[PDB]
Design an enzyme around this catalytic site. Sequence first.
Site, mmCIF file in Angstrom:
data_model
loop_
_atom_site.group_PDB
_atom_site.id
_atom_site.type_symbol
_atom_site.label_atom_id
_atom_site.label_comp_id
_atom_site.label_asym_id
_atom_site.label_seq_id
_atom_site.Cartn_x
_atom_site.Cartn_y
_atom_site.Cartn_z
ATOM 1 N N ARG A 26 36.292 34.494 26.908
ATOM 2 C CA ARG A 26 35.654 33.314 26.336
ATOM 3 C C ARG A 26 34.332 32.992 27.032
ATOM 4 N NH1 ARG A 26 40.452 29.026 26.957
ATOM 5 N NH2 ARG A 26 40.148 29.706 29.123
ATOM 6 N N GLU A 54 46.165 19.542 26.841
ATOM 7 C CA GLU A 54 46.492 20.632 25.927
ATOM 8 C C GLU A 54 47.252 20.116 24.713
ATOM 9 O OE1 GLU A 54 44.353 22.264 27.465
ATOM 10 O OE2 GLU A 54 45.317 24.229 27.643
ATOM 11 N N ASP A 99 38.431 19.388 31.545
ATOM 12 C CA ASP A 99 39.863 19.645 31.461
ATOM 13 C C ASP A 99 40.411 18.651 30.447
ATOM 14 O OD1 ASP A 99 39.850 21.592 33.475
ATOM 15 O OD2 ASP A 99 41.655 20.760 34.416
ATOM 16 N N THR A 100 40.746 19.131 29.259
ATOM 17 C CA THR A 100 41.281 18.256 28.227
ATOM 18 C C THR A 100 42.787 18.452 28.110
ATOM 19 O OG1 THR A 100 40.979 19.906 26.486
ATOM 20 C CG2 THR A 100 39.149 18.404 26.918
ATOM 21 N N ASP A 125 39.094 21.742 24.411
ATOM 22 C CA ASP A 125 38.221 22.543 25.267
ATOM 23 C C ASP A 125 37.724 23.894 24.755
ATOM 24 O OD1 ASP A 125 40.846 23.822 27.536
ATOM 25 O OD2 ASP A 125 40.462 24.091 25.403
ATOM 26 N N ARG A 132 34.601 28.340 25.821
ATOM 27 C CA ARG A 132 35.395 27.401 26.600
ATOM 28 C C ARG A 132 34.382 26.431 27.201
ATOM 29 N NH1 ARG A 132 37.378 23.913 29.378
ATOM 30 N NH2 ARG A 132 39.307 24.071 30.610
#
EC number: 3.1.31.1
Length: 129
Positions: A75, A37, A34-35, A15, A29
């Site tokens: 970000r 982690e 939502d990837t 992400d 970002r």
Amino acid sequence: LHKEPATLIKAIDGDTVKLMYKGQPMTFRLLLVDTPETVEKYGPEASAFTKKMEENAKKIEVEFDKGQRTDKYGRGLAYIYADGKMVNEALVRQGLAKVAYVYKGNNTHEQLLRKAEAQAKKEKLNIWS
């Protein structure tokens, strides 16, 4: 919304990516995704996917949405394109990320991403395995 040119500096993970934007390095970002982690399940898959797509691209473009442009950590919040293909969308479609909740009015492509996610789910791809 309009796309702006950028140059890849370093892929950090699924992400987030570091880009040279308007003459200066900046961490971005990816909006609405939502990837896992990086180490959660499919985390390395998502990271490698994003990395390969970004490093092999001839042109990288950034597209800010209509809401707030940076999060609390400094970000940039944007849709990233690799040779015309939106990375945010590719990740979701490939089942390597879920659509995140809208953030501060940044939802121009929420429907596009929701549909890609429904298809990945129907195909039971990766995360939806």
